[PDB]
Amino acid sequence: NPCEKHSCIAVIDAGSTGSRLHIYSYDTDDTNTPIHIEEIWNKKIKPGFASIQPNSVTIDAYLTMLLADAPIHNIPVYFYATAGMRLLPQSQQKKYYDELDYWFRQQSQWQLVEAKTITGNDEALFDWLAVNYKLDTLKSVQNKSVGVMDMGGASVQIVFPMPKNAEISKHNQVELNIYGQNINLYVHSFLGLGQTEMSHQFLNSPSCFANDYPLPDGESGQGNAPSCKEEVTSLMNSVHKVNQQIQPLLALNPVNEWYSIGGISNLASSQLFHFENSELTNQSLLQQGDNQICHQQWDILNGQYPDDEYLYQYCLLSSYYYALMVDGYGINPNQTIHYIPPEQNLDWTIGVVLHRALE
Amino acid sequence: NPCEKHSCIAVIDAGSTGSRLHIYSYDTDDTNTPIHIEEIWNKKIKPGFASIQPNSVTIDAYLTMLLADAPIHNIPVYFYATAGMRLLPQSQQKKYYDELDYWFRQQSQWQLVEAKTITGNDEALFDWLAVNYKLDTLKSVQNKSVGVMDMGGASVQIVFPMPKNAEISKHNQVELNIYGQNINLYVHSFLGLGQTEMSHQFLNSPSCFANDYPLPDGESGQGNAPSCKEEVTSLMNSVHKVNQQIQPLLALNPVNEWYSIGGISNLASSQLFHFENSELTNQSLLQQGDNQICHQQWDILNGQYPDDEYLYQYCLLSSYYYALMVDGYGINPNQTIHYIPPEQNLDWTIGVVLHR
Ligand SMILES: [Cl-]
Ligand SMILES: [Cl-]
Structure with missing residues (x-):
């Protein structure tokens, strides 16, 4: 487990046809920029997050499926949705994030840093x-x-x-x-x-x-x-x-x-x-x-x-x-x-x- | 139950944003053409059929959500999808119909007459x-x-x-x-x-x-x-x-x-x-x-x-x-x-x- 000796984060690309979880390990240099970035897990599920029903049962099952079988736990997670979500009214986007934030708050082995549409x-x-x-x-x-x-x-x-x-x-x-x-x-x-x-x-x-x-x-x-x-x-x-x-x-x-x-x-x-x-x-x-x-x-x-x-x-x-x-x-x-x-x-x-950072 | 006294048919408009089930009772004139068409049941669900993941649990759950609480089940059903499905190639559309056909083969009150993209x-x-x-x-x-x-x-x-x-x-x-x-x-x-x-x-x-x-x-x-x-x-x-x-x-x-x-x-x-x-x-x-x-x-x-x-x-x-x-x-x-x-x-x- 590299995350015991190196910084790790998870980044989820929530795109139009599925969500892809990446876990990256890295070190930091004297300008404190990441170096030695390595992907240590990569898993995609279907369908796109913006295409499922925005309710607790569905989002919970989806998030569970995406984060299942991860070899590493207890790291920060960035959940960034792109164009699939940008296509939705912002009041519909909000329901998704409300539900997903809620799911993350009731477990303690992923630390959600940010979930949003970029x-x-x-x-x-x-x-x-x-x-x-x-x-x-x-x-x-x-x-x-x-x-x-x-x-x-x-x-x-x-x-x-x-x-x-x-x-x-x-x-x-x-x-x-x-x-x-x-x-x-x-x-x-x-x-x-x-x-x-x-x-x-x-x-x-x-x-x-x-x-x-x-x-x-x-x-x-x-x-x-x-x-x-x-x-x-x-x-x-x-x-x-x-x-x-x-x-x-x-x-x-x-x-x-x-x-x-x-x-x-x-x-x-x-x-x-x-x-x-x-x-x-x-x-x-x-x-x-x-x-x-x-x-x-x-x-x-x-x-x-x-x-x-x-x-x-x-x-x-x-x-x-x-x-x-x-x-x-x-x-x-x-x-x-x-x-x-x-x-x-x-x-x-x-x-x-x-x-x-973001905009 | 108006279908005891009249012909009835269920027609689903499976469009790009949702599917709407209608059940219509009707009589017919001397050419056997429908007259006195009345709507006895109208249920809409979202999203469009062609936008859900085409596996059997997802399609079966959607059809159940659409049809299972209908008050009359032993009638002809026409399931016609439109532009949502036209956006997909035929090999993808086939997956949806195969699952749909199977769900109807299991609910043998409904009489599926056609399920297709018009x-x-x-x-x-x-x-x-x-x-x-x-x-x-x-x-x-x-x-x-x-x-x-x-x-x-x-x-x-x-x-x-x-x-x-x-x-x-x-x-x-x-x-x-x-x-x-x-x-x-x-x-x-x-x-x-x-x-x-x-x-x-x-x-x-x-x-x-x-x-x-x-x-x-x-x-x-x-x-x-x-x-x-x-x-x-x-x-x-x-x-x-x-x-x-x-x-x-x-x-x-x-x-x-x-x-x-x-x-x-x-x-x-x-x-x-x-x-x-x-x-x-x-x-x-x-x-x-x-x-x-x-x-x-x-x-x-x-x-x-x-x-x-x-x-x-x-x-x-x-x-x-x-x-x-x-x-x-x-x-x-x-x-x-x-x-x-x-x-x-x-x-x-x-x-x-x-x-x-
Ligand atoms: Cl944009
Ligand atoms: Cl056309």
Whole structure:
């Protein structure tokens, strides 16, 4: 038991399709920042916390199931819900936290520090911290601007270095002091551009599905990644104005290197795709998606990759990631995007180890 | 027990936000078509069926919560799911039906006749039938065109009279016979344009919420219904193409009387709005939404109307209904829109009684 000799905390990522408990051990350096962060337990249950009934019987069973079988007890716990909960009226969110806080108060082997819905901005901050901890770029001043994108189930985040600026909302900027240095980041998140929210507007678009895929309106897929990508661009830009919001900032604050986590890692490392060195370009992503998925017959594809649960959306997702990065964020279609290998299955929770404040 | 003296049927509308069980008694006329339809039981539960974990304990508990206290069990059941399920691929929907079928194989009072996800087009037909049955316009050849809109949580339906049309997907029209008259309807369902799904595109848009309402990203609302409405219009027309599909057909087949069911009734009959005779116009809906929610200080307005979980959405919803009906369907902003009083809890299920 490492928690007898090292600091440990638990961080629960309560996301849209489940809740994932992580337990991290670590030490602290002379700037009192965490170092030697190690994950010693990782367990996910379904479904998403915001999707269960907010009553004591249900929440109690859910929390019990999540915290069952934990090898370590008697540590602090941070329960951070993200977009799944952000989608609910705040008076509904309150019932959940009331019930969960109550559950924690009537037991004494987990010490609940905080249970709340974090903003997409806090979540972007954590995204940027987790990736840069892994790349070991936090301890020393960086010459290169590292940008991070999180392609999540229920929101997407973008975050990159930017100097303190009086003309951008203060909720989109974070200044942090970590390892002795000051880092100033622009943070942004989008709910309606999450994969779930975005997909629910295109399920009847034939260009976004493999040929003969049955669309819910009774028509057939006729997959065409560029056509699908143009349609998704209308959501990005005519509706959400991502281009107007994000392209001026990246032009004034260039990113030297892009890293991504979330669904993009999962799609890119699927056997339908061929990428080396855990990196892709948007150009290649769209072309591969169009050739490998959009232009194939659904039943053949489905038969060839069984129990591959988001397969039916791969044509749409290829197109949507392009539309988001290139048409929305303005990123060159030939620029390299690093993705964190999906085996490490990284989420933003390491950022909570590193940074315990919120907005 | 009214089912001793009359035919009865149970019809569940398993929509995106909840399922509503209705039990209807009825007699029939000389064609064996239902008449004298009365509702004898109405129970709603939440959340939507398609949103619960598809394992057997969760599905069985939900069906029990829906059906077990019903006062009559030995009757035909039609379980029709709609847009909540349309959001899921067929392999996921199958899991839900397999468990559901099993639960019915165990409760052998109920006679499950069908449990399936219906098409948006069948749903729209049901919408039109249910509303016209209640208005009593079915028994005779109407000299006016009655249109119906169903403002659901995940999809929205529009349906109105239109003669056969070689230029229109036959997915979008239906001929029906009822009470011995033929009627052709145009039908259309727009998936993702229901109020819940659509609201998930706008929760951080300051134009769509009361001044200083705290948005999920930490920003403040800065309500302005024309700005909100325009954003919603981009979803309707840049993304979904509603105007291009619907406006030319209403131009050629005008509707004299629009009726609506679903969320518009709940919004319009709330205490924030002032409408008489269960009808509104879009122009009045937008202006009242704009003046009495969008342009209000949130904390003050919230303290003024305490009893009201959805109040904070009224800026967005007023702007949305306007975008849909006026910018999407092309309805004159001054044309009366009748909405069914919310206390009737009218959905499309009367249509199942009538057409199966
Ligand atoms: Cl549909
Ligand atoms: Cl947010």
